[PDB]
């Protein structure tokens, strides 16, 4: 209260405590690029080696789906079955659900459902994984010339790198892009036929001879009396070298020669998963992604990870280098540096405004030390309430800086004015000034808190970002009010002592005479106000809506898609062309290209490829020709002539949660009983009905693969049984020969690896190869497989999808030039109804969020407006006075809208929060003016007109000072065009165009509003 | 099984996955010649034992498929209780009718 | 052990290396005669180890059933000579034919700490000395070891080291806090400075 | 302060304590039982008052 003026030491002690707490908070506060924005999702992954999409869907996916019940907080679930034998089920949970609890629930359900799955997928092991996608580093390892292939690098990084990491302080998860070692046994049908052998015999002999036998104990218990010996017994140990596996005895002939595995097969240390080609700048490589932890510091974690990698680099075998694509530490460091620079420049600008208006160094001293105390206390409060240091919180701090500047300016200017007139000593003048503006400060705090609450009380992914912004703003506001009520009065009482002037006096006289001319025919301006109001409406109907501006992250992503049925040779050639272009035509900007062939976004397959392109630092690429958007727009033209690929480049979304703020994601559920063909017929009816109306939807496309030719083998069971051949043997030899056969595990250098049995390459490449395999009769005679089997060519789906246990198609689209997203979703709705009978639709991903929480912001802001009106009524002790304050903030928002339209930006989140800050500051100025007028009406016996003019005259100076300080504080944000320029430009535009129009309109419009409301 | 067999297969397979935990202070592990693997993870003070047990059992099933048979058949025990004996209650026979 | 004035009763918390028995089965000879390697391995494992077969009922409770060789038949390395394996034709052949026995060495207990091999060591402090002095002496002794071995404190020693490291910062922070509290309570910077000079006394 | 020895918590008399017997490696339970019986018979005879 006002009793701190008598006790400066208490105020200084409180400031010191605030600074110490802020330093402690900064010392240990987690930092990250973004907080947890996406809702928690749990991923269940199962592998069926050699199975098709339909086989996987019928065996694994449906069985796992049917047991996915009883999970709390579940929103939806989507499953995908690939042609490589992969079943992936993603379950999305409501925001606020504990990821560990959801993971354990899903794991327990799958654990109970496990016995229903086939033994082949039980052997591989079904993995339940949390999903956060807060990737910190994508550090990769490369072989210099040609020495180590992709599999050697992957195995080394799996066995001597992953375990040293994953335990470094701040590291939560390490994921690997590659395949470890395995004992590949490539069979030969002719060699097997020569010795009358089948793959079943080889598998059985491997299972019996690559075994671990528990010998037991010599001695042991119970034991005879006087026993003095007790030792362990060794019988067999798992094999550990390819040569050991090549000596596995299969059979002994009557001649006596021993038949070994090497006599019928090639044994080689190969890979577990062969369906991925990873290249870094054209050279084989394997990478790891580090996913950080909770409560960890992203800067020290990155430094420690780099230090550990450098230490382990001395143990590398040969020609192994460590590169670091996608490091997100620089952006966090840049954000922190920008925040500190903004604070310092704001302090300097405040000092200049004070020693331009007040002309007193002692006056300039007080805010210079008042602002950092509040900033540090805000850091302490953020640590106390459990909030991390990310881009959003730091940006909220940036706006908070101007919020604090306003309060410091008004307090110091009021004290200095009361010193200047009435000839009062600094202590008595401080007491008087604080008596004048105590209730005004409390009411301003309450009003601003009510204004910022709706952002806190939101839902969904956007709700969390708005929570960060609102919490930062509210904490800074409340602490600024407390500081301006406790420390600043004491500093003013202790520190303060008892050209431009002509221009300012002339401007004040001009305002006075303009008001004298006005306030007689206010009606004109009245209707004029409505005109501006009307304009505001149309302005709010013109600015496009976007979530978060795309930033120059320094990396972007190019996807290559071959038409269909294309092998990895053509995909590798296409990716080689892409990387050659990116490395020889953009060598000044592009640093590296990481190409993963065989793995796309629409599903793993041999006709897909992905490429991560990492750019040079912004200190080496300057201008617009060397920007990410320009780079991709130049690359799209060049890559359109790639000759039978659909290669397409794009920029990474700002947050992994979402992008394409205009696009929509929908799933066309089949429902009913119509099959896959009757569903693809509906999907083809759409994408055509939608394409017939391009005025609302532009990019209606399917996110999935299309039907491909498939090989069918029809085995004559009756013929095989008549000839003595068992159908089981026929079905097993083909499966083992063409698909892999996981046998057991062996030990490579102390680590457990798999053993796989499959046919050699040249024996499984053409339809004619099935004529080279033989099966044994019950009498021991081998007969060809071409006798009991026939071949045929059919068509089948290489990737099946399901949504909530129902087959779906996931037709994702986009919005028109200007049509809003809701209209697109209301068109595709009933566009599905025009589709054949049976099908239905669901909105997932982004469109789900804009399907449950839509009419929420208007209700929150209506409640906020009611609370603001009630607080103003309590402050002014009247029911009509608040209207003269409430009818002014449209003047604040109109200028911001006009400036944002002029610059050409969109309705970003940063724009919204800056607009809220400008409205709050305009409301604060109006509240102060009206409070002074009400006081001069209560005492001094003055009419409402003279009181309002005199109050405006008195408060002209602080309003001008605050407006100048805030406008010039966000000036560098607009002019910035380098790293992290999106949010900076947005806030600069918004604040700079809002504050000036707000002050200019309000200082003239307050008296007319006041007199009009008082008359009524 | 012998000590080396357990320490290679069971102990190391289970230990290779206990990495991304919440407040892990340190982890010890023993493998015995009687066929016993005894991994022990000591967490930071203030951690919830329920959350720690949930995380440990979640990361254990990432290594369960790699464990050999006759080890999953016996069962994996994940316990969040104390590691020190609180009280020992023995039972004897007065005359000596019942043996051990 | 040669410095009894600082540490007493230093012992390892583990088991020392022991001789172990190794049986090598000739798969080639076994297949030539007709017996299967699986049969030989199963026979050895059941005879000298055990074989949990099924569950049975006893006094209303489900208990386990185990199969093992008799006590006299699994006490000596020569007892392997007494076991026979059935051939594919039904004739029984001795296990001592297609087998060779030898002796090796092995560790009966393997310990790891934080993912690397380790050896736990226990011990007390000598009379007069404290636990901290014993810890410092142990660290100095470990510093005089072959390159490649380190030491870690665990259990009670972890907490002891943490407390000893973190005490002085607590003292300093407490002093600062009480100084600020005095300055706030009595509006002067002279009383806190005149009072904080008594703390060393 | 620099000369005072450090510690964590003083030792206490809890009324119970432990004894560990470790025989040479490769020993059987026939000898361990004898060693443990020697320990028991020492504790119950030479310290029967406590
Ligand atoms: C730390 C936690 C405890 C803080 C101290 C609690 C007691 C504060 C002082 C109250 C009694 C002192 C006193 O005589 O003040 C009276 C109450 O003043 C008042 O108006 C009350 C003081 C205003 C609230 C105190 C703010 C402290 C919060 C900071 C810590 C967090 C009248 O004095 P007066 O105001 O009439 O004096 C002359 C101006 N008329
Ligand atoms: C400190 C005493 C008050 C206290 O428990 O702190 C928080 C303030 O909440 C409250 O009790 C609000 C009362 C006013 C506080 C300012 C409660 O929140 P918490 O973090 O203890 O519990 C919520 C976690 N679910
Ligand atoms: C001065 C020195 C610097 C500041 C030091 C920081 C600590 C003291 C600040 C006191 C203000 C409240 C913030 C700290 C409370 C943190 C806390 O535990 O409560 C959180 C919210 O509760 C709440 O406390 C929410 C209610 C807050 C009420 C604020 C309105 C009363 C004060 C009015 C402002 C002054 C104007 C005077 C004219 C919930 O914790 P959690 O569950 O999130 O965390 C645990 C899991 N993460
Ligand atoms: C908390 C800090 C209190 C410090 C003392 C300053 C006085 C103060 O806060 O105003 C009192 C009520 O608040 C107000 O100014 C009431 C306006 C806020 C309305 C919001 C309440 C919604 C529930 C009325 O102070 P006063 O008029 O008695 O004296 C004050 C002028 N001399
Ligand atoms: C010191 C006393 C501190 C008082 C703190 C009050 C705010 C925190 C408590 C939670 C209130 C929630 C509430 O009713 O406000 C939401 C709207 O915001 C609003 O109501 C905006 C204004 C909030 C009050 C402004 C701050 C206190 C001034 C009081 C005058 C309503 O949304 P919901 O929670 O129902 O959302 C569910 C959606 N269906
Ligand atoms: C001593 C001097 C100390 C320094 C000065 C005072 C500092 C005040 C600090 C205020 C803390 C702001 C952050 C509070 C964190 C609360 C929290 O957990 O955040 C969300 C809730 O937000 C919310 O509940 C909204 C934020 C609450 C802000 C405090 C209420 C406004 C007070 C207005 C009057 C104050 C001035 C009076 C003169 C999550 O909660 P959720 O998502 O679960 O939602 C709630 C339903 N469970
Ligand atoms: C915190 C724990 C100790 C403070 C609370 C104990 C009661 C103290 C109390 O009520 O004293 C008030 C005075 O406090 C004061 O004038 C100063 C408040 C003392 C606490 C120090 C505040 C700064 C924080 C320093 C670190 C935390 C401690 C009112 O007593 P009165 O009315 O007779 O006062 C004479 C002036 N009229
Ligand atoms: C007349 C005394 C008014 C006191 C109002 C509360 C001041 C302390 C707030 C601390 C937060
Ligand atoms: C009123 C609350 C005072 C104590 C704040 C503690 C923050 C957790
Ligand atoms: C909301 C709590 C009350 C608002 C301020 C009342 C006077 C300090």
From Swiss-Prot, chain B:
| Species assigned in the record | Escherichia coli (strain K12)
The identity of this protein, by name, is Multidrug resistance protein MdtF
Induction context: Induced by EvgA, probably via YdeO.
Listed under subunit, the entry gives: Homotrimer. Part of the tripartite efflux system MdtEF-TolC, which is composed of an inner membrane transporter, MdtF, a membrane fusion protein, MdtE, and an outer membrane component, TolC. The complex forms a large protein conduit and can translocate molecules across both the inner and outer membranes.
> Where in the cell does this protein reside?
Cell inner membrane
Record-stated family: Belongs to the resistance-nodulation-cell division (RND) (TC 2.A.6) family.
* Function statement: Part of the tripartite efflux system MdtEF-TolC, which confers resistance to compounds such as rhodamine 6G, erythromycin, doxorubicin, ethidium bromide, TPP, SDS, deoxycholate, crystal violet and benzalkonium.
**Disulfide-linked positions:** none
């Amino acid at each position: 209260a006002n009793y701190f003026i008598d006790r400066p030491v208490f105020a200084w002690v409180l400031a010191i405590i605030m600074m110490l707490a802020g330093g402690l908070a900064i010392m240990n506060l987690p930092v990250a690029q973004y907080p947890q924005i996406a809702p928690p999702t749990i991923t269940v992954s199962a592998t069926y080696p050699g199975a098709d999409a339909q086989t996987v869907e019928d065996s694994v996916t449906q069985v796992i789906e049917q047991n996915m019940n009883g999970l709390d907080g579940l929103m939806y679930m989507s499953s995908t079955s690939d042609a490589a034998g992969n079943a992936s089920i993603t379950l999305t949970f409501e925001t606020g659900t504990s990821p560990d609890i959801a993971q354990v629930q899903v794991q327990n359900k799958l654990q109970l459902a496990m016995p229903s799955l086939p033994e082949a997928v039980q052997q591989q092991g079904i993995s339940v994984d949390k999903s956060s996608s807060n990737i910190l580093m994508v550090a990769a390892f490369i072989s210099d010339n040609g020495s180590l292939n992709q599999y050697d690098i992957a195995d080394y990084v799996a066995s001597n790198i992953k375990d040293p990491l994953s335990r470094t302080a701040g590291v939560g998860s390490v994921q690997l892009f590659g395949s470890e070692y395995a004992m590949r046994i490539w069979l030969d049908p002719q060699k097997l036929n020569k010795y009358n052998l089948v793959p079943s015999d080889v598998i059985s002999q491997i299972k019996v001879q690559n075994n671990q036998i528990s010998g037991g104990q010599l001695g042991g218990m119970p034991q005879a009396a006087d026993q003095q010996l007790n030792a362990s017994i060794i019988v067999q140990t798992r094999l550990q070298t390819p040569e050991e596996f090549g000596k596995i005895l299969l059979k002994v002939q009557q001649d006596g020669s021993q038949v070994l595995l090497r006599d019928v097969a090639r044994v080689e240390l190969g890979a577990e998963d062969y369906s991925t080609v990873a290249r870094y700048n054209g050279k084989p490589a394997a990478g790891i992604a580090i996913k950080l932890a909770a409560g960890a510091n992203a800067l020290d974690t990155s430094r420690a990870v780099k230090e550990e990698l450098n230490r382990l680099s001395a143990y590398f075998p040969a020609s192994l280098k460590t590169v670091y694509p996608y490091d997100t530490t620089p952006f966090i460091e840049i954000s922190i540096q920008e925040v500190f620079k903004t604070l310092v420049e704001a302090i300097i600008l405040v000092f200049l405004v004070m020693y331009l208006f007040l002309q007193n160094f002692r006056a300039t001293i007080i805010p210079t030390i008042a602002v950092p105390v509040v900033i540090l206390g805000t850091f302490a409060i953020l640590s106390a309430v459990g909030f991390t240091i990310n881009t959003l919180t730091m940006f909220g701090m940036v706006l908070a800086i101007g919020l604090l500047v306003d309060d410091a300016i008004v307090v110091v200017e009021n004290v200095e004015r009361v010193i200047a007139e009435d000839k009062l000593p600094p202590k008595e003048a401080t007491h008087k000034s604080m008596g004048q503006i105590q209730r005004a400060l409390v009411g301003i705090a309450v009003v601003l808190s009510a204004v910022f609450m709706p952002m806190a009380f939101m839902s969904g992914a956007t709700g969390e970002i708005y929570r960060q912004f609102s919490i930062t703003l509210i904490s800074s506001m409340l602490l600024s009010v407390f500081v301006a009520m406790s420390l600043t009065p004491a500093l003013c009482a202790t520190i303060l002592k008892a050209r431009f002037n002509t221009l300012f006096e002339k401007s004040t006289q001009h305002y006075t005479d303009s008001t004298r001319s006005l306030l007689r025919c206010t009606g004109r301006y009245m209707v004029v106000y409505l005109l501006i109001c009307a304009g505001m409406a149309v302005l709010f109907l013109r600015t496009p809506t976007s979530f978060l501006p795309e930033e120059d992250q320094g990396v972007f992503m190019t996807t290559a898609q071959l038409p269909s049925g294309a092998t990895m040779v053509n995909t590798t050639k296409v990716l080689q062309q892409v990387t050659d272009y990116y490395l020889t035509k953009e060598k000044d900007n592009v640093q590296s290209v990481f190409t993963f062939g065989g793995f796309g976004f629409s599903g793993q397959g041999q006709n897909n490829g992905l490429a991560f392109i990492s750019l040079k630092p912004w200190s080496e690429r300057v201008g617009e020709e060397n920007s990410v958007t320009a780079i991709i727009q130049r690359a799209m033209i060049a890559l359109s002539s790639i000759n039978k690929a659909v290669v397409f480049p794009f920029n990474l979304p700002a947050v992994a949660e979402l992008g394409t703020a205009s696009g929509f994601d929908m799933e066309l559920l089949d429902n009913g009983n119509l099959g896959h063909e009757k569903l693809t017929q509906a999907r083809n009816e759409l994408l055509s009905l939608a394409a017939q109306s391009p005025n609302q939807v532009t990019g209606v496309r399917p996110n999935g693969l299309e039907d491909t030719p498939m090989f069918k083998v029809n085995v004559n069971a009756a013929k095989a049984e008549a000839m003595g051949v068992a159908l089981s043997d026929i079905n097993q030899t083909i499966s083992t020969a063409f698909g892999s056969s996981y046998v057991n595990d062996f030990l490579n250098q102390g680590r457990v690896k798999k053993v796989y049995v499959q046919a050699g390459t040249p024996f499984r490449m053409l339809p004619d190869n099935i004529n080279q395999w033989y099966v044994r009769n019950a009498s021991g005679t081998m007969a060809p497989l071409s006798a009991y089997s026939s071949t045929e060519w059919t068509y089948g789906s290489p990737r099946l999808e399901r949504y909530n246990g129902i087959p779906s198609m996931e037709i994702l689209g986009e919005a028109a030039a200007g049509k809003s997203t809701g209209d697109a979703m209301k068109f595709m709705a009933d566009l599905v109804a025009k589709l054949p009978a049976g099908v239905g639709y669901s909105w997932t991903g982004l469109s789900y969020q804009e399907a449950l929480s839509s009419n929420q912001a208007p209700a929150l802001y209506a409640i906020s407006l009611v609370v603001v009106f009630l607080a103003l009524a309590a402050l002014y002790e009247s029911w009509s006075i608040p209207f003269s304050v409430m009818l002014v903030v449209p003047l604040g928002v109109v200028g911001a809208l006009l400036a944002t339209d002029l610059r050409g930006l969109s309705n970003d989140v940063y724009f919204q929060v800056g607009l809220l800050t400008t409205i709050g500051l305009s409301a604060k100025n109006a509240i102060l003016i009206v409070e002074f007028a009400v006081e001069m009406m209560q005492k001094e016996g003055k009419t409402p007109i003279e009181a309002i003019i005199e109050a405006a005259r008195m408060r002209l100076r602080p309003i001008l000072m605050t407006s100048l300080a805030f406008i010039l504080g966000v000036l560098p944000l607009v002019i910035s065009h380098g790293a992290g320029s999106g949010a900076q430009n947005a806030v600069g535009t918004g604040v700079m165009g809002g504050m000036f129009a707000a002050t200019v309109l309000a200082i003239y419009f307050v008296p007319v509003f006041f007199v009009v409301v008082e008359h009524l």
